[PDB]
Structure formats: C-alpha cells, structure tokens
Amino acid sequence: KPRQKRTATKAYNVTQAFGRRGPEQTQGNFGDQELIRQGTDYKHWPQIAQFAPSASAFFGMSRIGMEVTPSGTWLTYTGAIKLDDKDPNFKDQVILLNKHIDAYKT
Amino acid sequence: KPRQKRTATKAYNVTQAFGRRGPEQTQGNFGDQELIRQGTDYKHWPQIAQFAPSASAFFGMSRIGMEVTPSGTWLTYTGAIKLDDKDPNFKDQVILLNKHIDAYKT
Ligand SMILES: [Cl-]
C-alpha cells in the first residue's frame, strides 16, 4: 500500500498505483498506453524489470537525499544503471526502453 | 551479476557490490561504516529497505531517461518517495536515513 511497494497489474494498473504519466517533477514519465494498462502483466515486463534495482542496489548505487517540502518529507534518489552494450539483446533493450520513456507525449 | 541485481551482505559487502561511497555522479553516497560492511545483514536493514521501490514502482514512480556517453549507455533515474509523517516511527525513520546519507564524509 505504501506507493513504493505497489505492483501494478492489469487489475491495478500503472495509473491506479502511480498516477498519470506526465512532465512534472512529481510524475513518472515511463510507459506507453499498453504498459500503463498492463503493469507487470505487460508482454515485455520481464525485459524491463531486468533493469530495476534490488533494495540493496537501490541504496547502494543511488545518490540519496531528503527534502522537507510543503507537501511532506521525501527520500530523494538519482542514479544510473549501465546497460551492457555487448549483450546481443542490447539494441532490443534500448528500443524497448525508448518505447516507454516519455511515451505519453506521442 | 549485473550491478542493479546485487544484494550486499557481510560476505559480499556494499563496497564489493556497489563501490566506495563518494561524491561523484557514478558513486553511491548512502551508508555508514556498519551498513557498508554488512549490507542486508545490517541490524536496521528492514527499516531502510521499506523505502526501496518494487521493480514496478521503480519504473512507475521515477523519471526515467537514457544517455549515451563514452563510458557506456545508461538508464538514468530520479524520483522522490514520500514518508508518512503520521507513522509513530517517522522521526526515527528520518534519523536513520540521515545517519547514512553522506556518512562517508564524517
Ligand atoms: Cl517484477
């Protein structure tokens, strides 16, 4: 029920769990219409999930901060996950992620 | 094993998995000496892990990008996870995260 622990599915999709996609700093930007509708039921979810960090890696790799704003107290995070450009699936992986980044603008 | 899927423990600690804490863009900044050396064996690891995102929430909550540089092709990410200041453990949660944020500077 805490937002960060939700898992979107067709029965409880990306908008229900995580809000509409959009350009504001408080919004997620990732997902075309079918990923939004299907969440982890999406046809290529495992190929996306392979880039998501474990809890240990989330706190080990990221730059972590905290911010107390008018809306509340936030744990902030930024980081980058390196793709293997030698993987024979590398080009497909780039295509897959680009299909969903800022897809709401199309 | 791909870095984002690693789990640090006493036998394979945060440094071995995720590199030394530091100030640079490629470095994690989170963890005091105890957490670094113990990973998920750390005494308060569950109280930290409760803020890590599920794979679905990682891609649902974060602002996702991609960058190509001489150092590789990168999936970049940023976001903010709200704490519940109505939780009676809220203050101790803020204290715990603050203890580990940039602790390498102390
Ligand atoms: Cl998953």
- State the resolution, in angstroms: 2.0
**What is the DSSP-derived secondary structure letter of residue B54?**
P
CA distance A77 to B75: 14
Are A77 and B78 a contacting pair, CB within 8 Å? Answer: yes
As a whole number of angstroms, the distance between CA A10 and CA A17 comes to 11
Structure tokens at B98: 């603050």
Of A93, A103, A87, nearest in space to A48 by CA = A93
> Residue B77 in contact with residue B60, Cβ under 8 Å?
no
Contact status, residue A12 vs residue A39, Cβ threshold 8 Å: yes
The answer to whether the Cβ–Cβ distance between B52 and A4 falls below 8 Å is: yes
Alpha-carbon span B27 to B103, nearest angstrom: 13
CA distance A70 to B69: 37
Residue B17: what residue type? A
Q: Give the method of determination.
A: X-ray
Asked if A12 has any chain B CB less than 8 Å from its own CB, the reply is no
> CA A2 to CA A4: how far, in whole Å?
6
CB-CB under 8 Å, A64 with B30: yes
d(CA A15, CA A21): 8
3-state DSSP of A27-94: CCCECCHHHHHHHHHCCCHHHHHCCCCCHHHHHHHCEEEEEECCCCEEEEEEEEEECCCCCCCHHHHH
Q: CA dist A1 to A26, A87, B84, Å?
A: 18, 36, 12
**List of chain B residues whose C-beta atoms are within 8 Å of the C-beta of residue A56:** 6-8, 14, 17, 39-40, 49
Q: Is B98 exposed, middle or buried (0-12, 13-18, 19+ CB in 10 A)?
A: exposed
